[PDB]
Amino acid sequence: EWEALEKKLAACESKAQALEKKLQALEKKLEALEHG
Amino acid sequence: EWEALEKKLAACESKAQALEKKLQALEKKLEALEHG
Amino acid sequence: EWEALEKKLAACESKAQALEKKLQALEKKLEALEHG
Ligand SMILES: [Pb+2]
Ligand SMILES: [Zn+2]
Ligand SMILES: [Zn+2]
Ligand SMILES: [Zn+2]
């Protein structure tokens, strides 16, 4: 359980970093529409 | 504390899954505007 | 390690709350375009 929890937390942190980049990518496309 | 930490990690993982789906839903609406 | 894990989990939870607010902010701008 302890080692499984360490790995689950690292996976959740990784997923948050990937979601922040996806949000930046969608913001870029939104801004092109807003200022087009 | 240990059992509280397990539950807090599961809640954070759940929230990440719900945020990924919300991002997909916003991407779908953005793509309809971008290709309309 | 245990105390470092507690702090890493709190940081991940904080990041999720900030990403939810960023998603709401992008949704607001998207909705203005969709209903403009
Ligand atoms: Pb987390
Ligand atoms: Zn703008
Ligand atoms: Zn597109
Ligand atoms: Zn709408």
Side-chain angles (χ1 to χ4, degrees), chain A residues 1-6 9-36, chain B residues 1-6 9-36, chain C residues 1-6 9-36:
Chain A
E1 280 152 274
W2 165 261
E3 292 183 38
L5 189 133
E6 300 187 295
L9 173 60
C12 193
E13 288 175 315
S14 172
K15 184 170 190 303
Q17 291 163 38
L19 290 173
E20 180 167 43
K21 295 277 257 168
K22 285 179 195 184
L23 173 134
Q24 289 165 28
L26 291 181
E27 179 167 355
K28 184 181 184 177
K29 289 160 155 284
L30 186 55
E31 291 294 343
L33 295 164
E34 182 167 277
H35 302 278
Chain B
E1 280 152 274
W2 165 261
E3 292 183 38
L5 189 133
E6 300 187 295
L9 173 60
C12 193
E13 288 175 315
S14 172
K15 184 170 190 303
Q17 291 163 38
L19 290 173
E20 180 167 43
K21 295 277 257 168
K22 285 179 195 184
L23 173 134
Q24 289 165 28
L26 291 181
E27 179 167 355
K28 184 181 184 177
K29 289 160 155 284
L30 186 55
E31 291 294 343
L33 295 164
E34 182 167 277
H35 302 278
Chain C
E1 280 152 274
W2 165 261
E3 292 183 38
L5 189 133
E6 300 187 295
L9 173 60
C12 193
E13 288 175 315
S14 172
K15 184 170 190 303
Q17 291 163 38
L19 290 173
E20 180 167 43
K21 295 277 257 168
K22 285 179 195 184
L23 173 134
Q24 289 165 28
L26 291 181
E27 179 167 355
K28 184 181 184 177
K29 289 160 155 284
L30 186 55
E31 291 294 343
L33 295 164
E34 182 167 277
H35 302 278

